[PDB]
Design a protein around this ligand. Structure first.
Ligand SMILES: [Mg+2]
Ligand SMILES: [Mg+2]
Ligand SMILES: [Mg+2]
Ligand SMILES: [Mg+2]
Ligand SMILES: [Mg+2]
Ligand SMILES: [Mg+2]
Ligand SMILES: [Mg+2]
Ligand SMILES: [Mg+2]
Ligand SMILES: [Mg+2]
Ligand SMILES: [Mg+2]
Ligand SMILES: [Mg+2]
Ligand SMILES: [Mg+2]
Ligand SMILES: [Mg+2]
Ligand SMILES: [Mg+2]
Ligand SMILES: [Mg+2]
Ligand SMILES: [Mg+2]
Ligand SMILES: [Mg+2]
Ligand SMILES: [Mg+2]
Ligand SMILES: [Zn+2]
Ligand SMILES: [Zn+2]
Lengths: 63, 102, 25, 81, 129, 151, 225
RNA sequence: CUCUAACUAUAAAAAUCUCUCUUCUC
RNA sequence: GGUGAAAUUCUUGGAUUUAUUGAAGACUAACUACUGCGAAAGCAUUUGCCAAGGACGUUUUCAUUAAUCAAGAACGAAAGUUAGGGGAUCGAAGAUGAUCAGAUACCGUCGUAGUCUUAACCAUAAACUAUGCCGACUAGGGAUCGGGUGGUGUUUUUCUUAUGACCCACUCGGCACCUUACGAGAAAUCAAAGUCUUUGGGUUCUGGGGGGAGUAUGGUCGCAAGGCUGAAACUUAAAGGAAUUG
């Protein structure tokens, strides 16, 4: 079922755009932290793009 | 016509396998076409544990479990409902019945 | 018929006839 | 795929493949100049040495038989050449 | 250790006419062999749980009479070449021995399992019921 | 992947390098190679043993690369060639070993089967060598002259 | 209940009022030296009961013998050797597991290694011992099975044979049991085998007594008070 | 974006079957 | 006991169980898997000896020695035949007690030859993967077994390196598997049963409708059982394959 009111709350809840983009480097430590490989990928790509490299510890538990 | 691509045997590269007797009718069957069930059970039924639990020396006894495989001839496996007569496209599904309880 | 038992029947027939051969000599 | 340059495989891809399957059938092995911890002389050894190689100078067997390369003797020094 | 003089009930539960047979710790001295077919009339129901309760209750009565108070259990199927699986009745006998006064401890299964010998009775095609 | 007598299809082998000439870093002399080859031959090692030892101990990659000629040919020119080619001799040795094992313990039948395979190979190789005329055309391998050639 | 034929081819008594009770004593090796009771037919001359008692064997769990529950799956058979009147002694006769623990260890996707050996004690007690070991899944293994090579199995069996031979040939069976109860040989086997393959659940099993020299009265007295 | 625990327990006997087989073109 | 229910049968000379022992021959449980070895049959306690083989590694050795192969040969499940040895289990024959109209069948008990061996015959099996062998190419995915590769890898542990066991990315070979058709097939299906009308890699052996019939006869091997070889007269419009709906 769909009456026009429901279409309208679906619209106005959907037309909602949040405030800051949730990436923005603003959350979760200013300037994101990623692994070395994508860091050097951006480096080779030749873009400044601030960075925070780190290790990954690729060892896998039992899972 | 070949009913099962795996030939319904599961031997496939062994020549010949030792035979094992059926558990109900004692028909000898190759140890691979030898439908087989892990009959692990508590030595006492859960319906009667409580009587044992409160009327026994050795507080918090282990209450062990009895272990044994069961080997059926496929005739018994079908009649005793251990194995059902599945449908065509459902034959090629070998995963056990979705881990009966989970 | 099962071909197995037809072969067995002919085989026994052969055995009887060859015993007939042997007894004749 | 569907378009390559079999003349010019990637060197990483080239060594990636198996020998006898490359462009030119080349050997994976090499020759190491090994010096015994005792004597400073230089003795050449094939990397996958079969026999128990012995330095003619002294009975100081340097590499032991193995399926793959011969295992060194924990004291020698090898140079790639 | 409050002076529980011990025993071993040693239920032998087959697919027909189960057994309850309490004896000393060494097993040398029997107390009330009395069996499943002792107290049932059909001779088809010898394996039935009711035979188990009847046999168990009377052997428990004899157990109290003699003096034994605590019992260890040797559950045994036919074993050997035959079916390796505990008899349907014997479990009911276990329950009854648990109920009727007797103290129980150290449950064990002693079904004789062979190491693959003594070709099982039945022929190749086996029982063809 | 042929493996006449077993369906095994392996390709375990060696890929000798493309450079026909010697490696640039080699310091030994081709002649000195020749004298060590001949002296090891005097010690009695077969040309396969010769090659493996010269590869393990010294910079000898292929004696054909270094001396310009191959080990068996060096021996033949120097007059140290064996009367029976080494591979064949190894076949006789294996065959007589299997024969001794078989006669020692009768019931082993796979031993008999492997003996038949080995005799097939040895007859085949002898036929080849007779065609190339390394062996005398009357050279024959059955049981007893076999044992004499074992000695 | 009837259906009888009675192919026989009432002087009844009370056969249990005509019987005596006797005590069971475990050697000084274990903690709880007392074991329990035993009913016996009354001792009359011309078949004195003490003749009948000597030779009896009793299967007793190690949990009762030690109080703790970790010895639940163990099982010791003790032989009746000396009778003192209303009270009798026992000497060690055999060791075994409860079958249930044995089966619990016996699982799929991990091959089991068995080591069987006949060994002579330090004194004279000719024994046969068995050892059961299972491969242990590693701490990081994604491989779904934990199978061991045949050569690894041979080496492990040889190692376990040597360790068992050492342990039995060291000391007498009294000391041997005093070693058994702490199951120290288990840690020794794991020690000498953890380099080859992990081997979870090492367990010494079915200690079988085969021969005994004459009687050794004095040691038996020493083992009981 | 963190996981691998439950389980039962049936079979006695039942053999045979006379016809009559007939189109698709708008 | 034994069964769907029962009987035959053993049992107060005490059968059934309850313990210790001991004898015999048997097999090697559970580990046991879409895993391994072998040419195939087949192979499963431990240990030593005997010889053998695959695959992998190899800047080692010879230089066409290669593939299949009429003729010829070796192995060749079980049953069978000789003879000698053993003789547990289980069971053709027979003996039985049931079921039924009959049941000398299926269920039930005993029991001979065999089942296990030691030398010799037998050489057939649905000896099936109902796919001959050797080659080259063609599509995605994983694991798994054997070897060998590289890790600044992990725990290992002997402080630390060394091993071993694992994790990763491999690679070579093996049993296989999953997905798919863009190839085939008549389809069921096949990663070969593809690269076959756009018809040619090298090679052996088989079939020409079904019955008659693997029968007749002659050879040939075998003591025998029988095996290999192998028709015709004649009789029919079908038999057969795969799938579809009832
Ligand atoms: Mg194979
Ligand atoms: Mg199956
Ligand atoms: Mg039926
Ligand atoms: Mg009629
Ligand atoms: Mg009795
Ligand atoms: Mg086993
Ligand atoms: Mg294996
Ligand atoms: Mg031929
Ligand atoms: Mg036979
Ligand atoms: Mg009858
Ligand atoms: Mg009959
Ligand atoms: Mg019968
Ligand atoms: Mg019988
Ligand atoms: Mg045939
Ligand atoms: Mg025809
Ligand atoms: Mg025919
Ligand atoms: Mg003829
Ligand atoms: Mg059809
Ligand atoms: Zn069955
Ligand atoms: Zn040195």
């Amino acid at each position: 079922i769909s009456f026009k009111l429901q279409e309208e709350e679906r619209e106005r809840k959907d037309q909602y755009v949040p405030d800051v983009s949730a990436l923005d480097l603003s959350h979760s430590n200013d300037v994101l932290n990623v692994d070395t490989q994508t860091a050097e990928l951006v480096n080779s790509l030749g873009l400044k793009l601030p960075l925070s490299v780190s290790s990954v510890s690729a060892v896998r538990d039992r899972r | 016509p070949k009913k099962r691509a795996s030939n319904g045997r599961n031997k496939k590269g062994r020549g010949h396998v030792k035979p094992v007797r059926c558990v109900n009718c004692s028909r000898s069957v190759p140890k691979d076409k030898a439908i087989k069930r892990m009959a692990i059970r508590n030595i006492v039924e859960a319906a009667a544990i409580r009587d044992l639990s409160e009327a026994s020396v050795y507080a918090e006894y282990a209450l062990p479990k009895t272990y044994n495989k069961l080997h059926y001839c496929i005739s018994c496996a079908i009649h005793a409902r251990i194995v059902r007569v599945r449908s065509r496209t459902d034959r090629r599904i070998r995963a056990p019945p979705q881990r009966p309880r989970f | 018929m099962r071909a197995k038992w037809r072969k067995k029947r002919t085989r026994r027939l052969k055995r009887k006839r060859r015993k007939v051969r042997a007894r004749s000599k | 795929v569907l378009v390559q340059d079999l003349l010019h495989p990637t060197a990483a891809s080239e060594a990636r493949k198996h020998k006898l399957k490359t462009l030119v059938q080349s050997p994976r092995s090499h020759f190491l100049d090994v010096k015994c911890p005792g004597c400073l002389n230089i003795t050449t050894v094939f990397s996958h040495a079969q026999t128990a190689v012995t330095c003619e100078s002294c009975s100081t067997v340097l590499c032991t038989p193995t399926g793959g390369k011969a295992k060194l003797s924990e004291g020698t020094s090898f140079r790639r050449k | 250790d409050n002076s529980q003089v011990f025993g071993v009930a040693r239920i032998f539960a087959s697919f027909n006419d189960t057994f309850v047979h309490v004896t000393d710790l060494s097993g040398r001295e029997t107390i009330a062999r009395v069996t499943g077919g002792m107290k049932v009339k059909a001779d088809r129901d010898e394996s039935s749980p009711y035979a188990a309760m009847l046999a168990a209750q009377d052997v428990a009565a004899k157990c109290k009479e003699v003096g034994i108070t605590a019992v260890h259990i040797k559950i045994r199927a036919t074993g050997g070449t035959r079916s390796k699986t505990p008899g349907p009745g014997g479990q009911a006998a276990l329950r009854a021995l648990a109920r009727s006064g007797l103290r129980i401890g150290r449950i064990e299964d002693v079904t004789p399992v062979p190491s693959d010998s003594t070709r099982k009775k039945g022929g190749r095609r086996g029982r063809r019921l | 992947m042929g493996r006449m007598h077993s369906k095994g299809k392996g390709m375990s082998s060696s890929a000798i390098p493309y450079s026909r000439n010697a490696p640039a870093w080699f310091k030994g002399s081709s002649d000195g190679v020749v004298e060590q080859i001949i002296k090891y031959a005097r010690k009695g090692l077969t040309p396969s043993q010769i090659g493996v030892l010269l590869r393990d101990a010294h910079g000898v990659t292929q004696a054909k690369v270094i001396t310009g000629n191959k080990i068996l040919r060096i021996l033949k020119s120097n007059g140290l060639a064996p009367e029976i080619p080494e591979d064949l001799y190894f076949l006789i040795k294996k065959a007589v070993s299997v024969r001794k094992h078989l006669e020692r313990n009768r019931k082993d039948k796979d031993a008999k089967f492997r003996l038949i395979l080995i005799e097939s190979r040895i007859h085949r190789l002898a036929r080849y060598y007779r065609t190339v005329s390394v062996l005398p055309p009357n050279w024959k391998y059955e049981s007893a002259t076999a044992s004499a050639l074992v000695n | 209940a009837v259906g009888k034929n009675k192919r026989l081819s009432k002087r009844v008594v009370d056969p249990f009022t005509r019987k005596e009770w006797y005590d069971i004593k475990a050697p000084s090796t274990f903690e709880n030296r007392n074991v329990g009771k035993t009913l016996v037919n009354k001792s009359v001359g011309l078949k004195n009961a003490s003749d009948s008692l000597k030779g009896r064997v009793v299967e007793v769990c190690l949990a009762d013998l030690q109080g703790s529950e970790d010895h639940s799956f163990r099982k010791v058979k003790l032989r009746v050797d000396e009778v003192q009147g209303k009270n009798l002694l026992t000497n060690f006769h055999g060791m075994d597991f409860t079958t249930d623990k044995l089966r619990s260890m016996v699982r799929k996707w991990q091959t089991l290694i068995e080591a069987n050996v006949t060994v002579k004690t330090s004194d004279d007690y000719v024994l046969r011992i068995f050892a059961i070991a299972f491969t242990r899944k590693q701490a990081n293994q994604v491989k779904r099975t934990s199978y061991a090579q045949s050569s690894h199995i041979r080496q492990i069996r040889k190692v376990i044979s040597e360790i068992l031979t050492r342990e039995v040939q060291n000391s007498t069976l009294a000391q041997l049991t005093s070693k058994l109860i702490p199951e120290v040989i288990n840690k020794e086997i794991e020690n000498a085998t953890k380099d080859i393959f992990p081997l979870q659940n090492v367990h010494i099993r079915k200690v079988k007594l085969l021969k005994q020299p004459k009687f050794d009265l004095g040691s038996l007295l020493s083992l009981h008070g």
